[PDB]
Amino acid sequence: PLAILFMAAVVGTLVGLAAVAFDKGVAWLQNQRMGALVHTADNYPLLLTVAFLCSAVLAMFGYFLVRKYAPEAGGSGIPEIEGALEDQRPVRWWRVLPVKFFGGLGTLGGGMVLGREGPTVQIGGNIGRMVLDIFRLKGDEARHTLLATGAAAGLAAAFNAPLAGILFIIYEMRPYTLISIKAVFIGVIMSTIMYRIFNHEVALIDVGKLSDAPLNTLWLYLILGIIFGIFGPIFNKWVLGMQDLLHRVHGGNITKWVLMGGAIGGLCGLLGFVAPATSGGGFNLIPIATAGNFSMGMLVFIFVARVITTLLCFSSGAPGGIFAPMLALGTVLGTAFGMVAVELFYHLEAGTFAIAGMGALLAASIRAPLTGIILVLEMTDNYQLILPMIITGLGATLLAQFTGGKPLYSAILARTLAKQEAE
């Protein structure tokens, strides 16, 4: 039906504006947190206290909204869209949309280590469901198609990356008709154009162009892969385990949870001023890191800072994503390997192994190799590292297989589902 191809356009266009706002939203909440500190930019004990509390409040707000009204708006929300496409999960958009948005401005705006793609995809998905209900389109086809174009449009707008969005939903989320593919395109065209209208000529990741990688250099990317390939499934266990560790801290009780959350949002809000490249989504430090401005000491610091703050903010059921984070760890560890590879040798530039590393964690952890490659392509515009990036991918994603890990988003879903049976 022409119906869905039309519907898909409108879902794209809503998901576009939806995400643009969630941006201008987070954007604006951080401007405030500047003024909160520029008022108190003398009294140093106070400076640190507002920094904390401002953030600690906003997390709690968001944390509350999830645990009050929309439980399944904790975490990424992508395992929920996975589950929905599997007809294993409801899409309660009437609850989820307003929660995941004001929830997300909570924790992202307080500067916790979460990405927008968490929100934008679950939202974008819920929005696809919302229009399906409104026009009361009947069938599995239309239920799934709008669900998916919503996700695709969400992800596209998170990273200004239409090709990424299409690839990830249509191809790297398990085994789509002829038309539902085009719906997803139409969904992702509109979504992008919206973002592009309200954002054009301001990128998320500047790195200009780095050099090629010499053919003699390539074998190194494969090793970087192999490392990410064992690290990915370890870090998965950590995020899966840490969900439990922080659950023995509050047993389910909402007041305990919203206290924990604002501690964890405050901590992060604090690190906002003191140690900036340990907070945020990653997108500030990625280019600073890729330009090579970080003393390998600082690298291993930021790496461990962020691998802890990431697990802390994400595994603690906050509304937010672990996708932008896994780009920033990708870059920071890529850079390190990079410097170590330059010292150890060839015509290398640690720069190029950041780019390569950036997508490597998506390959290793969530097991979307092509999405990762095409994403860093679209974000950095470094055409010239595609073969390294394919090589890093293979390595990352072969080891992650043999080291026995599973796709993070599925393992999350398959818990959520085993829980909604043994209860």
Residues interacting with a second copy, by CB under 8 A?
5, 162-163, 166-167, 171, 175, 178-179, 182, 185-186, 188-189, 192-193, 196-197, 200, 215, 218, 370, 373-374, 377-378, 381, 383, 386-387, 390-391, 393-394, 397-398, 401
Q: Give the nearest residue (CB) to Cl ion.
A: 321
Taking the C-alpha atoms of residue 39 and residue 201, their distance in angstroms, rounded to an integer, is 32
317 sits near Cl ion (criterion: CB under 5 A): no
Q: Which residues of 207-218 are buried (b: 16+ CB within 10 A; e: fewer)?
A: beebebbeeebe
92 binds, among Cl ion, a second copy, none (CB under 5 to 8 A by kind): none
CA distance 170 to 145: 10
Which partner from the list Cl ion, a second copy, none does 192 bind, CB cut-off 5 to 8 Å by kind?
A: a second copy
Least Å distance, CB 231 to a second copy, is: 18
Q: Cα–Cα distance between 69 and 65 in angstroms, integer?
A: 6
Q: Which of the choices a second copy, Cl ion, none does residue 323 contact, using the CB cut-off of 5 to 8 A by kind?
A: Cl ion
Number of residues that bind Cl ion (CB under 5 A): 5
CB of 114 to a second copy, least distance (A): 27
Smallest distance, Å, CB 82 to a second copy?
A: 18
**Residue among 378, 343, 397, 6 nearest 172 (CA):** 397
Annotation-wise, does 195 bind a ligand?
A: no
CB 190, min distance to a second copy, A: 10
Which tokens in the block code for residue 353?
A: 């192994």
Q: Which is nearer to a second copy, 315 or 397 (CB)?
A: 397
Q: Out of Cl ion, a second copy, none, which partner does residue 111 contact, by CB within 5 to 8 A per kind?
A: none
391's contact among a second copy, Cl ion, none, with CB below 5 to 8 A by partner kind, is a second copy
Whole-angstrom distance, CA of residue 313 vs CA of residue 282: 13
Distance of CA 392 to the CA centre of its chain: 20
The Cβ-side half-sphere exposure at 120, using a 13 Å CA radius, reads 36
AA identity, residue 77: G
Q: Which is nearer to a second copy, 102 or 171 (CB)?
A: 171
Q: Are 313 and 268 in contact (CB under 8 A)?
A: yes
Q: Does 159 bind Cl ion (CB under 5 A)?
A: no
Taking a C-beta distance cutoff of 8 angstroms, is the pair 191, 153 a contact? yes
Q: Is 321 helix (H, G, I), strand (E, B) or coil?
A: strand
Q: How far apart are CA 191 and CA 182, in angstroms?
A: 14
The token pair at 147 is 């669900």
Please report, as residue ranges, which positions from 50 to 79 form the binding site for Cl ion (by CB under 5 A): 76
DSSP string, 166-198: HHHHHHSS----HHHHHHHHHHHHHHHHHHHHT
Cα separations (Å) of 417 from 84, 322, 351?
11, 20, 42
Does the annotation list 409 as a binding residue?
A: yes
Site string for Cl ion, 74-103 (x = CB under 5 A): --x---------------------------
**Dihedral sign computed on CA atoms, order 7, 96, 18, 204:** negative
Report what 86 binds from a second copy, Cl ion, none; CB cut-off 5-8 Å by kind: none
- Least Cβ distance, residue 220 to a second copy (angstroms): 14
Distance between CA atoms of residues 397 and 368, nearest Å: 9
Does 235 sit near Cl ion (CB under 5 A)?
A: no
Beta carbon of residue 353, minimum distance to a second copy (angstroms, whole number): 17
Residue 314 near which of a second copy, Cl ion, none (CB within 5-8 Å, type-dependent): none
Bind-site residues:
76, 322-323, 409
Bind-site residues for chloride:
76, 322-323, 409
Binding residues (CB under 5 A) for Cl ion: these are: 76, 118, 321-323
